[PDB]
Design a protein around this nucleic acid. Structure first.
Length: 136
DNA sequence: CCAGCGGCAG
DNA sequence: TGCGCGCTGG
């Protein structure tokens, strides 16, 4: 279980559900966290699981993502990612549609106990990881 | 009521 | 290469 930290990372609240944590990383991509977080709550209220998100009509998701931008791109990504999350045989989420380095590094630091094996590039994640190494 | 900025899949 | 908004700054 990740310890108490001076950091403001949405991953620290979402880590028990890998899917929600990964969805947050999709919301945060090329988007202001100020915008992305309140919209992520609206999304999670309507789609609280991959089970329902994979059955969603991406155009419904898109309408919700409108003020964040990349709404069609991210809506189609979310639906497809959610389907792969439950149906593909994955060990690391980098194998899944729409997930890259950011989501993968977040998963290995927060959902699994592999923070030592990770080289984060995201500014906050990198400082958080520096704090783990310092306080190990 | 300006306008630059910020990696995934195809 | 397309994707996109509003925040940010002044």
């Amino acid at each position: 279980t990740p310890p108490r930290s001076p950091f403001n990372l949405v991953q620290e609240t979402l880590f028990h559900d890998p899917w929600k944590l990964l969805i947050a990383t999709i919301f945060l991509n090329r988007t202001s966290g100020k915008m992305a977080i309140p919209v992520l709550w609206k999304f999670l209220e309507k789609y609280p699981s991959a089970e329902v998100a994979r059955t969603a009509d991406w155009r419904d998701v898109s309408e919700l993502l409108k003020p964040l931008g990349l709404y069609d791109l991210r809506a189609k990504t979310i639906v497809k990612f959610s389907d792969e999350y439950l149906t593909k045989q994955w060990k690391y989420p980098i194998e899944l549609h729409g997930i890259g380095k950011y989501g993968n590094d977040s998963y290995r630091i927060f959902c699994v106990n592999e923070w030592k094996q990770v080289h984060p590039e995201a500014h906050k994640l990198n400082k958080y990881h520096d704090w783990l190494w310092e306080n190990h």
